[PDB]
Design a protein around this motif. Structure first.
Motif, short mmCIF file in Angstrom:
data_model
loop_
_atom_site.label_atom_id
_atom_site.label_comp_id
_atom_site.label_asym_id
_atom_site.label_seq_id
_atom_site.Cartn_x
_atom_site.Cartn_y
_atom_site.Cartn_z
N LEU A 23 -47.33 -36.30 -25.15
CA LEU A 23 -45.97 -36.78 -24.89
C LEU A 23 -44.99 -35.69 -25.30
CD1 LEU A 23 -47.68 -39.39 -24.79
CD2 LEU A 23 -45.75 -40.57 -25.85
N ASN A 24 -44.63 -34.85 -24.32
CA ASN A 24 -43.66 -33.80 -24.59
C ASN A 24 -42.26 -34.36 -24.84
OD1 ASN A 24 -44.99 -31.19 -22.34
ND2 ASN A 24 -45.63 -31.79 -24.41
N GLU A 25 -42.01 -35.63 -24.52
CA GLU A 25 -40.75 -36.26 -24.84
C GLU A 25 -40.92 -37.77 -24.74
OE1 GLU A 25 -37.47 -35.39 -22.19
OE2 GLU A 25 -36.02 -35.68 -23.80
N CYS A 26 -40.27 -38.50 -25.65
CA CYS A 26 -40.28 -39.96 -25.58
C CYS A 26 -38.93 -40.48 -26.05
CB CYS A 26 -41.40 -40.56 -26.41
SG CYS A 26 -41.58 -42.34 -26.12
N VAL B 113 -33.82 -33.83 -25.00
CA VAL B 113 -34.69 -32.79 -25.54
C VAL B 113 -35.54 -32.18 -24.44
CG1 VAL B 113 -34.73 -33.75 -27.87
CG2 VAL B 113 -36.44 -34.52 -26.19
N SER B 114 -35.97 -32.99 -23.47
CA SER B 114 -36.86 -32.49 -22.42
C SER B 114 -36.22 -31.38 -21.61
CB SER B 114 -37.28 -33.64 -21.51
OG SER B 114 -38.24 -33.22 -20.56
N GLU B 115 -34.93 -31.51 -21.29
CA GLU B 115 -34.29 -30.52 -20.45
C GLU B 115 -34.20 -29.17 -21.15
OE1 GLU B 115 -33.49 -29.47 -17.77
OE2 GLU B 115 -32.12 -27.86 -18.36
N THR B 116 -33.75 -29.16 -22.41
CA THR B 116 -33.45 -27.91 -23.06
C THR B 116 -34.73 -27.14 -23.39
OG1 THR B 116 -33.41 -28.97 -25.23
CG2 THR B 116 -31.33 -28.83 -24.01
N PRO B 117 -34.63 -25.82 -23.64
CA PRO B 117 -35.82 -25.05 -24.03
C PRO B 117 -36.48 -25.61 -25.28
CG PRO B 117 -34.03 -23.57 -23.49
CD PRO B 117 -33.44 -24.95 -23.54
N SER C 79 -41.46 -23.00 -24.27
CA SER C 79 -41.95 -23.68 -23.08
C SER C 79 -41.24 -23.21 -21.81
CB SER C 79 -41.77 -25.19 -23.23
OG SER C 79 -40.41 -25.54 -23.41
N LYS C 80 -40.00 -22.76 -21.91
CA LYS C 80 -39.31 -22.16 -20.78
C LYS C 80 -38.16 -21.32 -21.30
CE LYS C 80 -40.42 -25.79 -17.35
NZ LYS C 80 -39.86 -26.83 -16.44
N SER C 81 -37.94 -20.18 -20.65
CA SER C 81 -36.93 -19.23 -21.10
C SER C 81 -35.53 -19.81 -20.92
CB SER C 81 -37.06 -17.92 -20.33
OG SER C 81 -36.74 -18.10 -18.96
N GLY C 82 -34.61 -19.32 -21.72
CA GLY C 82 -33.23 -19.77 -21.65
C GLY C 82 -32.48 -19.42 -22.93
N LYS C 83 -31.67 -20.37 -23.39
CA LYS C 83 -30.83 -20.19 -24.57
C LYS C 83 -30.83 -21.48 -25.38
CE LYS C 83 -26.02 -19.24 -25.94
NZ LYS C 83 -24.65 -18.92 -25.44
N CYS C 84 -30.75 -21.35 -26.70
CA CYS C 84 -30.65 -22.54 -27.54
C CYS C 84 -30.25 -22.14 -28.96
CB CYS C 84 -31.95 -23.35 -27.54
SG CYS C 84 -33.45 -22.40 -27.79
N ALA C 85 -29.82 -23.14 -29.72
CA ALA C 85 -29.10 -22.91 -30.96
C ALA C 85 -30.05 -22.61 -32.12
CB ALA C 85 -28.24 -24.12 -31.31
N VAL C 86 -29.46 -22.17 -33.23
CA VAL C 86 -30.19 -21.88 -34.46
C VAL C 86 -29.28 -22.18 -35.64
CG1 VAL C 86 -29.50 -19.45 -34.54
CG2 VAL C 86 -31.60 -20.20 -35.69
N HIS C 87 -29.86 -22.72 -36.71
CA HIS C 87 -29.08 -23.20 -37.85
C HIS C 87 -29.97 -23.20 -39.08
CE1 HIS C 87 -26.51 -25.97 -40.25
NE2 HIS C 87 -25.55 -25.37 -39.57
N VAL C 88 -29.36 -23.44 -40.24
CA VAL C 88 -30.08 -23.64 -41.49
C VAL C 88 -29.57 -24.91 -42.15
CG1 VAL C 88 -30.42 -22.76 -43.83
CG2 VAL C 88 -30.71 -21.25 -41.86
N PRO C 89 -30.32 -26.03 -42.11
CA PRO C 89 -29.85 -27.24 -42.80
C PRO C 89 -29.89 -27.15 -44.31
CG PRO C 89 -31.32 -27.79 -41.00
CD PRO C 89 -31.46 -26.33 -41.24
#
Lengths: 107, 51, 120, 150, 50, 100
Positions: free
Chosen positions: D51-54, F38-42, F71-81
């Motif tokens: 499940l890559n997403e749920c 979540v599924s759409e983004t890298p 899982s797929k190339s692109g852009k996404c954020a980075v942080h330190v909680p």
């Protein structure tokens, strides 16, 4: 095996030309077709996967289309670095096979 | 071959099933009721209006 | 993501066994398929066969099946090709890539290729 | 504007439509000639599911990838023999060994279901997250079930 | 009543929970259906429906 | 030249600026439509991190490489909680499996 028929086998073109290469499968392969580029003395390079997905790092002048048995690789305006051999390939029906290749030479 | 399966009576929602046997490949079956109608048996007793 | 490197080029005598290894770096071999493809210089690409990383099953080109063995070596993160009873028709550049198919990106990495010359 | 079960009312003929009431016991007499042997159709071997997403939601908020190693490329069906998950799609296309995507809607917060696919089945399992909006503008697609535990 | 296209015979059994929004005795007016116990023919009383 | 907290002072309007005092309790009402699944983004899998350089300093003297298998190339954020480290950059670009 699934026989891949690439057309034409040879093509003469100039920088800026629109180039179309076709690939025919002996049976339907849905959209499971990849396109590779190969230069002399070098390994193939993936350009398009699953008939129309452009691989990252590959320029957008390359585009793929088709489904079933007929597929097309289009190069919108040929660049100097685009002179090479192109191969189609299907990962379908035992086993995975490549077309015979299309050599794109400088007119 | 006789097969039977309850289908929820919702309009617009689809329903799917697979019928299979030990030596036969799965045969899919799909149903989609786009409009379920409830017509009653009716007869006219009278008609009334302004006098 | 993934880098592949074939073992070094050289001679194999007619009727003897060609043996190649592909070493994967920067990635594991615990997913996907792992493939050998060859190219006789000047000519096209011929798929030799594949081994599926997760379960180890092999599939071979029908024209080569009787002479080809593929295997995976987890301890070195490598996979290998054995090709028996070679003749001059087996002279070619041999590439090792994730061919056949993968569950998320295959044939995206092609080993630079290694030339095997079958010679007396 | 007052009928139970959300029925719409129309007058020619006098009738009510789209009553979300009860269920229809369908019975299908399928001819013996329409069946096809297991050998002919694409046969699946050594599949894995994840499940890559749920998103536990009314719509098909759940995504699952099946890695497959098929005996021959083609097309074949996919289902879930349980009320836990309802799939958006009926059949998928397969190319030797690769991956395919299945959409579904779910009731379980801790989902686990047997995805039946192409003369095989794979045990999909995972953890699932709540949806975004409190109220949605369409009815449920997934069969409700008692289990929604930790 | 079956529907028999292409050799497969479909039979939709009786609706499991027989139920209607119409009572035994209804009225139509201006494209709207009302549940109303109108007087039987021959019992209509003044100042009321019927 | 005497105000506390390093405030600068200006006269039209009468005001003080750049007072390094306290904190601002920001509250953001983000619309439900701007969120993306979540599924759409890298989606990142099997990442490793290593501090190829660290200089404990006021400025961003610390460098870290993340090896990624996307899982797929692109852009996404980075942080330190956490308050331990503050990042110079907000998002990074990813290409299949590589380093950032």
């Amino acid at each position: 095996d699934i026989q891949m028929t690439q057309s034409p086998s040879s093509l003469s073109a100039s920088v800026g030309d629109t180039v179309t290469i076709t690939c025919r499968a002996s049976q339907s392969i849905s959209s499971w077709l990849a396109w590779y580029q190969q230069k002399p003395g070098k390994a193939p390079n993936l350009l398009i996967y699953k008939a129309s997905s452009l691989q990252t790092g590959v320029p957008s002048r390359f585009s793929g289309s088709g489904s079933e048995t007929h597929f097309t690789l289009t190069i919108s305006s040929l660049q100097s670095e685009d002179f090479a051999t192109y191969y189609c390939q299907q990962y379908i029906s035992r086993p995975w096979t490549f077309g015979q290749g299309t050599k794109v030479e400088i007119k | 071959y006789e097969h039977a399966t309850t289908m929820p009576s919702q309009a617009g929602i689809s329903y799917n099933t697979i019928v299979n046997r030990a030596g036969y490949a799965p045969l899919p079956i799909s149903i989609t009721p786009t409009k379920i109608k409830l017509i009653p048996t009716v007869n006219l007793e009278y008609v009334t209006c302004h006098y | 993501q993934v880098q592949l490197q074939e073992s070094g080029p050289g001679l194999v005598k007619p009727s003897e066994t060609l043996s190649l290894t592909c070493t994967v770096s920067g990635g594991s071999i615990s997913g996907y398929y792992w493939n050998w493809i060859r190219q006789s210089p000047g000519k096209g690409l011929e798929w030799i066969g594949n081994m599926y990383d997760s379960t180890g099953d092999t599939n071979y080109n029908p024209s080569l099946k009787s002479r080809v063995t593929l295997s995976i070596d987890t301890s070195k993160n490598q996979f290998s090709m054995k090709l028996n009873s070679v003749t001059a028709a087996d002279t070619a550049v041999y590439f090792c890539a994730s061919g056949s198919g993968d569950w998320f990106g295959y044939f995206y990495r092609w080993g630079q290729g290694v030339l095997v010359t079958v010679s007396s | 504007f007052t009928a139970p079960f959300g029925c719409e009312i129309y007058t020619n003929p006098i009738r009510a439509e789209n009553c979300a009431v009860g269920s229809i016991p369908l019975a299908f007499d399928i001819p013996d000639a329409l069946f096809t042997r297991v050998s002919e159709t694409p046969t699946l071997s050594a599949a894995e599911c994840t499940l890559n997403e749920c998103v536990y939601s009314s719509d098909f908020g759940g995504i699952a990838t099946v890695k497959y190693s098929a005996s021959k490329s083609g097309k074949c069906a996919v289902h879930v023999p349980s009320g836990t998950a309802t799939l958006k799609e009926a059949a998928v296309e397969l190319t030797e060994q690769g991956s395919a995507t299945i959409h579904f809607s779910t009731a379980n917060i801790h989902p686990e279901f047997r995805l039946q696919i192409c003369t095989s089945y794979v045990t999909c399992k995972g953890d699932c997250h709540p949806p975004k909006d409190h109220i949605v503008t369409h009815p449920q697609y997934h069969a409700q079930t008692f289990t929604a535990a930790v | 009543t079956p529907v028999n296209f292409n050799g497969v015979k479909i039979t939709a059994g009786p609706l499991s929970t027989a139920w209607t929004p119409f009572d035994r005795k209804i009225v139509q007016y201006a494209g709207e259906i009302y549940n109303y116990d109108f007087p039987e023919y021959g019992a209509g009383q003044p100042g009321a429906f019927g």
